[PDB]
Amino acid sequence: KITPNLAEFAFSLYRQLAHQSNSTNIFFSPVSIATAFAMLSLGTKADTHDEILEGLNFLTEIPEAQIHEGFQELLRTLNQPDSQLQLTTGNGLFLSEGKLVDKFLEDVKKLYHSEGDTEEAKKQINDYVEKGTQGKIVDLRDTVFALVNYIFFKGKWERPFEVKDTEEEDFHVDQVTTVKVPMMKRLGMFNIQHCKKLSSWVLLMKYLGNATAIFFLPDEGKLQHLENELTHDIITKFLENEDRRSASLHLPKLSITGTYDLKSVLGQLGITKVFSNGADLSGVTEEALKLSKAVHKAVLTIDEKGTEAAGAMFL
Amino acid sequence: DIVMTQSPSSMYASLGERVTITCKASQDINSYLSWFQQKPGKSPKNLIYRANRLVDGVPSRFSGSGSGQDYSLTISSLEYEDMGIYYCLQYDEFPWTFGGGTKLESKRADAAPTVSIFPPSSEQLTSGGASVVCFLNNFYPKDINVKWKIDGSEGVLNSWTDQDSKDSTYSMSSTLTLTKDEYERHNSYTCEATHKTSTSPIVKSFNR
Amino acid sequence: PPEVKFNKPFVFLMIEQNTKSPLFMGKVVNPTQK
Amino acid sequence: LEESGGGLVKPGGSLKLSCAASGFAFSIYDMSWVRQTPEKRLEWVAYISSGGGTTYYPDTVKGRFTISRDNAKNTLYLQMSSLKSEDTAIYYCARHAGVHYWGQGTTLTVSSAKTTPPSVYPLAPVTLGCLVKGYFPEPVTVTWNSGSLSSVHTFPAVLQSDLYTLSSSVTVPSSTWPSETVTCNVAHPASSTKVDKKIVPR
Ligand code: NA
Ligand code: NA
């Protein structure tokens, strides 16, 4: 219902994070960030309200109600997996007992299933972040109002690799640097194809359950061409499939972390009224409020058995 | 549990000579075999994995082939930096078992041992024990015989060096451990050393 | 061309099946950077 | 990767080894422990996959040894318990992705014999000797004139009713002795006893 705008946001956010610097690894969670600012979208007043929905690529043809309820069916569908893969999302809101409007409370309790001393608050927040993510995000405090969200992912490959064919092969970093990483090896039938619009190989490996990973191997020099012409319409076309060829797959194992504070990037996406003095947060409190930072952290793990990822957001 | 038979257990060779050792498994291992090398004073280093694919950084002298149950390691032109013990690894199935090991040693011309006998010092002798030591330094090959004559007639412990990294010779120490009364009773301690350089033993003796 | 090696920097998506929304997106340039 | 933590353990005791690592990720590689018996036979000890699952143990050590990872601190562990005389070996921590690289090892000695400093004796008659008799455990460091000559045979140690005994031989030109000092330096870290005994003519 809101997934086409959700992928466009994931790509708009991806471009600026990658355009900022292409010299390091990138890993973030679009759903966690989207829910964080969509949760705040219910407690914000005009001209900050609007910039928030527009910054999530939403106003034009959809009402504000149908947007918030898309996220309740979103988070309910994700928090209800047919458990072969482990997937859970959690929303937190750490108030400090002053003043609340209590209409913001009823809205976030319904739509998003949400649940001074610096040391006590810091330890309490990070335990809530480390509890749901199974200790993946452990070390992710300013003032009265804090909103936190977390996601946990743990799936297994439909056709797992064997841990004897994983040989250490070269990895081309920048046409001068070459590092050796443990690459997994497997032959057989794969859901692989060529775009002819992206100049890149597109490989889909489905996880056991309701999840699927897509891998884009760009041609020589076409890495930037891939990042610019990658849209929602093309991935849905790729997800309509079962044209499977056969090839030998060399997939490297992975373990990386994102750790982005992104107050600056969102301004480039239209959310400028985020930490502004003039920014209006009236649906939240009756005493008065503004944001100071927006930190996002996410970890990834790829092995022969499956994938284990977890992301968190702190506003 | 796959038993890894590795042949031969020990063999000599010269510089630039072709050396080939074999490793046979108790069952088929789908060519999942790795070859190691161990220097005497250092840890094993990986040379080949998958039985035909070299580890990055290993000289092109090492070859290797084999399929199913019989695998081989070949050195086209042997060097002095390749002398040591070679191990063959099995990682087709758990548990991962290795081979017995092949000792590769350097070869050279035959030599005679420098024999030296040592009476027990009076610092040890005033403790209830006495040890007569007989050194056999810088000989070749390994096989050498030692006879301990005490009064014209025959507790001996021996020790062997590995192989000298300079002249490729061996060295053995022979210690006859006696008591204070047993030592102080007899007089004519002799240490024969029988090698194949000649049919006459090389004798060292003393009188207290 | 059955020789697909991922030895170059690449981009990956991690999308849910039933919802069709991307849960994770990233770009791998060096696996050693952990 | 450099491992440490070895030492002497009484029979039935317990010990935990550690393998700290830097220079690679260590959160992307599979880790394992491999030991080298005094009979120079290598045999696989443990295998933990990457992340923590799943650990593998041969039946000889299953139920007694426990391998574990700490990817946050980049440290591999090996909890040993119910040690026997067969467990005495040099243990190695190994990272393997097809190719594997081993550390320099750490020595475990499982015996009920009590720690004992060596008794150093001069072996005078030109080949000079230095008898290191009755120490436990291994090793000892024998140098001639503080390693100045170092050109010298050090023989492997013999076990004589639960003590080690070895000899060290040095060959000098006939002009040097006793026209130049010859002292055999014997160090034993298990007892922290550095002993230097000169060699006298008679
Ligand atoms: Na590297
Ligand atoms: Na190498």
Numbering used by the authors:
A (entry chain A): 25 to 82, 84 to 123, 125 to 141, 148 to 172, 178 to 325, 327 to 353
B (entry chain L): 1 to 115, 117 to 155, 159 to 163, 165 to 204, 206 to 214
C (entry chain B): 361 to 394
D (entry chain H): 4 to 52, 52A, 53 to 82, 82A, 82B, 82C, 83 to 98, 101 to 126, ...
Reproduce passages from the article.
α-1-Antitrypsin (or alpha-1-antitrypsin; A1AT; SERPINA1) is an abundant plasma glycoprotein secreted into the circulation by liver cells. We sought to develop a monoclonal antibody as a molecular probe capable of selectively recognizing M A1AT at the single-molecule level. In an initial antigen ELISA screen, 1 clone, 2H2, was found to produce antibodies with reactivity against M A1AT but little against the Z variant.
Polymers are intrinsically heterogeneous in length; therefore, we used the RCL-inserted cleaved form of A1AT as a surrogate for their component subunits. The SPR sensorgrams showed that mAb2H2 had the greatest affinity for this conformation: the calculated KD with cleaved M A1AT was 59 ± 3.0 nM (±SD, n = 3), a 7.5-fold higher affinity than for native M A1AT with a KD of 447 ± 21 nM (±SD, n = 3). The mAb2H2 epitope localizes to the intersection between β-sheet A and β-sheet C. The structure comprised a single complex in the asymmetric unit in which the CDR loops of Fab2H2 interact with a binding site on A1AT interposed between the breach at the top of β-sheet A and the gate region of β-sheet C. Based on a comparison of crystal structures, this is a region that has been referred to as a structural scaffold and behaves as a rigid fragment during conformational change. Superposition of native A1AT over the cleaved form highlights the structural similarity. While this is consistent with mAb2H2 reactivity against both native and loop-inserted forms of M A1AT, the difference in this reactivity suggests that conformational dynamics (not typically observable by crystallography) are likely to also play some role in the antibody’s affinity for each conformation. The Fab binding site spans approximately 700 Å2 of the surface of A1AT (center and left); near its center is the Nζ atom of residue Lys290, which coordinates bonds with the backbone carbonyl oxygen of Ile31 and side chain of Asp33 of the Fab VH CDR1 loop, the side chain of Ser52A of VH CDR2, and the side chain of A1AT Glu342 (right). The Glu342Lys substitution of the Z variant results in repulsion of Lys290 (25), which would disrupt this network, resulting in favored binding to M over Z A1AT. However, the ability of mAb2H2 to bind both inserted and native forms of M indicates that conformational state is not a substantial contributor to the selectivity of the antibody.
